[PDB]
Amino acid sequence: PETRPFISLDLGTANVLAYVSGQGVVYNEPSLMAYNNKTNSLIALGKAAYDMVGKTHGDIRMVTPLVDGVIADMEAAQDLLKHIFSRMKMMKNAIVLLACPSGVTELEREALKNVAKEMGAELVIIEEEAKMAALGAGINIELPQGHLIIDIGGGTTDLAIISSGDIVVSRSIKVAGNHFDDDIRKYIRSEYNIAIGQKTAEDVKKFIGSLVKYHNERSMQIYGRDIVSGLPKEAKISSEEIRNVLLNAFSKITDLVIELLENTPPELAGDIMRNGITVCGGGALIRNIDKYFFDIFQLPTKIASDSLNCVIEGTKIFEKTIKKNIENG
Amino acid sequence: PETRPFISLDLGTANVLAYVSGQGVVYNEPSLMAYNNKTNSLIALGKAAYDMVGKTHGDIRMVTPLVDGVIADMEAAQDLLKHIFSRMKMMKNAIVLLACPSGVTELEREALKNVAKEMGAELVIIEEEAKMAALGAGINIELPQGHLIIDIGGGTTDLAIISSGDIVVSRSIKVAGNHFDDDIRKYIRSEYNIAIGQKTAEDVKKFIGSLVKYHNERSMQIYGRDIVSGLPKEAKISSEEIRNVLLNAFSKITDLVIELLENTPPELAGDIMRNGITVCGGGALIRNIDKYFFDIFQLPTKIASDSLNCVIEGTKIFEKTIKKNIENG
Amino acid sequence: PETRPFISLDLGTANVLAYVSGQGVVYNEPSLMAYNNKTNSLIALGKAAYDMVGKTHGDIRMVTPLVDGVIADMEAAQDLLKHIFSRMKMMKNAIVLLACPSGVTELEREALKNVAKEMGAELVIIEEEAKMAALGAGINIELPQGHLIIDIGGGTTDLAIISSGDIVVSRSIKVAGNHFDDDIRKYIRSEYNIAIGQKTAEDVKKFIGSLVKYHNERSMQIYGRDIVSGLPKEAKISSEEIRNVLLNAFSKITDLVIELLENTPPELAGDIMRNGITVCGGGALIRNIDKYFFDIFQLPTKIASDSLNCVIEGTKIFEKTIKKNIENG
Numbered sequence A, B, C: 001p002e003t004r005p006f007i008s009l010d011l012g013t014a015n016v017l018a019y020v021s022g023q024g025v026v027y028n029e030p031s032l033m034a035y036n037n038k039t040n041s042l043i044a045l046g047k048a049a050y051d052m053v054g055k056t057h058g059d060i061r062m063v064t065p066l067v068d069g070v071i072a073d074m075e076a077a078q079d080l081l082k083h084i085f086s087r088m089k090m091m092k093n094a095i096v097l098l099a100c101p102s103g104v105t106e107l108e109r110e111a112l113k114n115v116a117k118e119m120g121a122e123l124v125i126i127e128e129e130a131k132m133a134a135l136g137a138g139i140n141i142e143l144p145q146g147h148l149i150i151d152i153g154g155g156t157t158d159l160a161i162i163s164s165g166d167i168v169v170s171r172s173i174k175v176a177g178n179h180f181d182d183d184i185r186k187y188i189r190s191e192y193n194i195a196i197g198q199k200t201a202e203d204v205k206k207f208i209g210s211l212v213k214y215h216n217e218r219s220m221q222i223y224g225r226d227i228v229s230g231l232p233k234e235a236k237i238s239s240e241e242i243r244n245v246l247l248n249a250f251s252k253i254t255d256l257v258i259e260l261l262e263n264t265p266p267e268l269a270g271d272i273m274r275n276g277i278t279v280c281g282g283g284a285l286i287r288n289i290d291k292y293f294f295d296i297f298q299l300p301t302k303i304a305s306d307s308l309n310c311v312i313e314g315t316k317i318f319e320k321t322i323k324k325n326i327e328n329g
């Protein structure tokens, strides 16, 4: 029948999402998984392990199953989707739609399918994240109109020119959210001589981070370890200095856009001026990222609604398409 | 019986038309056909492929089945008329009237017949496009009065002196719509340093193109790729500069008219002054093309109604003639 | 019986006429016959081919069956009278009266009879055109009174002194209508540097041609090919310059009249002063040709009524005479 079960997965570097047809997104948690480093046993995953990063003894190993679409830890990758498939095992012929970044090789994608199949998958389908992100952002990719999708995730900023449902031009760079957190951590050590964890650096980016000055920007207090005294030390950080370090981090992302537009066919480039840039992903939540991209490229920039879910929302829309590609052909 | 099915085809370089007796023109779409360059499979044809030219990855091959009446792609030519014959297969002894330009050799015309026969044609008839265009423009070619037919198509400008239903003098040159689009593209690159696709160049010719200044000519905005910055760039183009580049493109067409009239018998040349020039085809829609031809040759110039359909409308009229040539003789 | 069918023919260089007893002139059309030069097949004859002269491709051969009474084309001559005999075949013992110019040899006249007999003629009679033209002009040739008949046809100007029903003195020259058309064509090329066809040159002679200035002579517009530019060119031509070129063309006809009167017996020459000159044929329609001949020879000149039909009208009158020569003798 056509009521066949359907599951799609966003195996992101920072957040893992799982959509089930008829039940919505049943799983949406960070990718961190805590393991007992003495017994190689699973301790926690999702939020329970994400609240412990930087707060664990050496006997607790923090693991990310997938980094930039590639299986970073085989034991963790299959432990993750076993937890997801078990909540589907307890409700038999589900369709497994995987979304893979453009940088994943075919050899690594066959590994993603087998790991899914090894844990109990019958039919595994792989689609490009860019067209999934474009579907979740509201673009009708079937139309012959060029669109520019910028997906700023946890460890990869993915760029793609999409027209007629295909990736005309594609670029990728390993500079994203995790790189922004490290630069914030390294800046606060060079400017205030205070060591902070990755979690504090990430919360600063979310609370006061921006690329253009916004209305009534506030300053927040950090709490870390003093390099000089060794004792815990406090510090006040303004939104401006967080903006200047994000400005510097976006330097390698901006030139990639120049390189993507350099090799874009002239008829597509015409559509980019009228259709514009669509920024999606976690990095799309940077304050005034639309005005920042507009001020540089003179291109109209819009932020997709629920940018975190553009990939998993696109797989929602693409379920009726793969069922056509399965029932037919 | 005399109610035998009848189909005629305009296999033009830019537009393909198909007339069925009793149903009118059932097919009228551009010639572009999109093929999967990895599997050599047909993806789209007509408008679906025409909206994608300049907007496709390298894995999509854009194909024109016939260029200037000659089979440019064997696989595409038979894929095209199979799509047309199928819509006739689903409604058995149809007459296939083909209209061929004057530049097609008899060896290439036998290929056009066999390809039609190979896909299921029983009786294939070939007629000259010039007399078909003259029939579709309102000329009674049976009368002993000379007429000058200028057919400006996609890739060929065809000239013919017609009298008593025969081609007295004939000339042809491979300078037409596609040459005009390229010159517009090359002018906008040399004047504004902006690369545009073929589709934008064609729309400029249709929206503001002309050969003589017309009432309240407007300027339009193009959108392409900047040669210098590599980013998409906008430009404003007036109707005057588009007129001057069309003026230069029509230089090789004007001297061909001089050459056609140079070798025209003196009694025919007398009729050309009184009957005049009949401009038909897509290029006949150039604004003030009648006044432009009149200012050069001092010959009265008239634009045929529905110049795009002069060939397919002429085959409509010539159905009762070929039935006479079939039932008799 | 005496109700035997009777057909007479005027196989002129310019016009072919056919009279049937009891039905009048059933055929009266120009001599031009159009043939497919690739298949030697008959395409058209009469007016249909006359409207195409100078307006045909090289694959269409224009043929005149008889030039100056001699079979110019054997295939065309028998194709012509087969078309005439067929309209008599569909209504069985007809009398075939042929009128032959004085320049036709007996060997060529036997060819005219056999070609008629080869297509289905039983009894073929040949008579002199001059006495037939004299009968059609109203002269009672049986009377012993001398008359001067000037027959200006398409390619021959025939002169004869007729008395008692016999040709006393006869002269002929190959200068007539076709020579006048060529001189008009050659004059318009030398005076205006414009090439015109034979049809335009003939219509000028008919519309404004004359030998003496007439009342309210007009100027007409020609349309031909310019020698310099190669483009069609217009020109205005007055009746005076057309008169001066006809005056020069009639130079060789005038001296022939002097030569005919030089060898005319003195008793006949006396009758020429009182009876006068009778001008018949197409050339008799030249405006003021009677006053022109009168001003030169001081001889009274009269134009025969329906000068084009003087030969075929004379054969009408000579039917009762040949029936006497057949029933008796």
Ligand SMILES: Nc1ncnc2c1ncn2[C@@H]1O[C@H](COP(=O)(O)OP(=O)(O)O)[C@@H](O)[C@H]1O
Pocket (backbone or CB within 6 Å): A011, A012, A013, A014, A015, A016, A152, A153, A154, A155, A156, A177, A178, A202, A205, A206, A207, A209, A280, A281, A282, A283, A285, A286, A287, A307, A308
């Ligand atoms: N409000 C916010 N402001 C700035 N950055 C954010 C915000 N929310 C999330 N992020 C960043 O976005 C990243 C997660 O986005 P996502 O596209 O789900 O990553 P991935 O697809 O790689 O798993 C996190 O690393 C986080 O640092």
Ligand SMILES: Nc1ncnc2c1ncn2[C@@H]1O[C@H](COP(=O)(O)OP(=O)(O)O)[C@@H](O)[C@H]1O
Pocket (backbone or CB within 6 Å): B011, B012, B013, B014, B015, B016, B152, B153, B154, B155, B156, B177, B178, B202, B205, B206, B207, B209, B280, B281, B282, B283, B285, B286, B287, B307, B308
């Ligand atoms: N309004 C217009 N103004 C100028 N050019 C036009 C217009 N409409 C069509 N054309 C040109 O005419 C061409 C198509 O005319 P057509 O005679 O159908 O070509 P073909 O017969 O070779 O297929 C196209 O290439 C297009 O560029």
Ligand SMILES: Nc1ncnc2c1ncn2[C@@H]1O[C@H](COP(=O)(O)OP(=O)(O)O)[C@@H](O)[C@H]1O
Pocket (backbone or CB within 6 Å): C011, C012, C013, C014, C015, C016, C152, C153, C154, C155, C156, C177, C178, C202, C205, C206, C207, C209, C280, C281, C282, C283, C285, C286, C287, C307, C308
């Ligand atoms: N109105 C006219 N004025 C001057 N010439 C004429 C006129 N009508 C006919 N003709 C000439 O007379 C010729 C035909 O006369 P006709 O005696 O029938 O010729 P033929 O007897 O040789 O066939 C034509 O060649 C034409 O040029």
Ligand SMILES: [K+]
Pocket (backbone or CB within 6 Å): A010, A011, A012, A013, A014, A015, A016, A017, A308
């Ligand atoms: K994610």
Ligand SMILES: [K+]
Pocket (backbone or CB within 6 Å): B010, B011, B012, B013, B014, B015, B016, B017, B308
């Ligand atoms: K066409």
Ligand SMILES: [K+]
Pocket (backbone or CB within 6 Å): C010, C011, C012, C013, C014, C015, C016, C017, C308
């Ligand atoms: K005649």
Ligand SMILES: [Mg+2]
Pocket (backbone or CB within 6 Å): A012, A013, A151, A153, A154, A281, A311
């Ligand atoms: Mg992502």
Ligand SMILES: [Mg+2]
Pocket (backbone or CB within 6 Å): B012, B013, B151, B153, B154, B281, B311
């Ligand atoms: Mg055409």
Ligand SMILES: [Mg+2]
Pocket (backbone or CB within 6 Å): C012, C013, C151, C153, C154, C281, C311
């Ligand atoms: Mg005659």
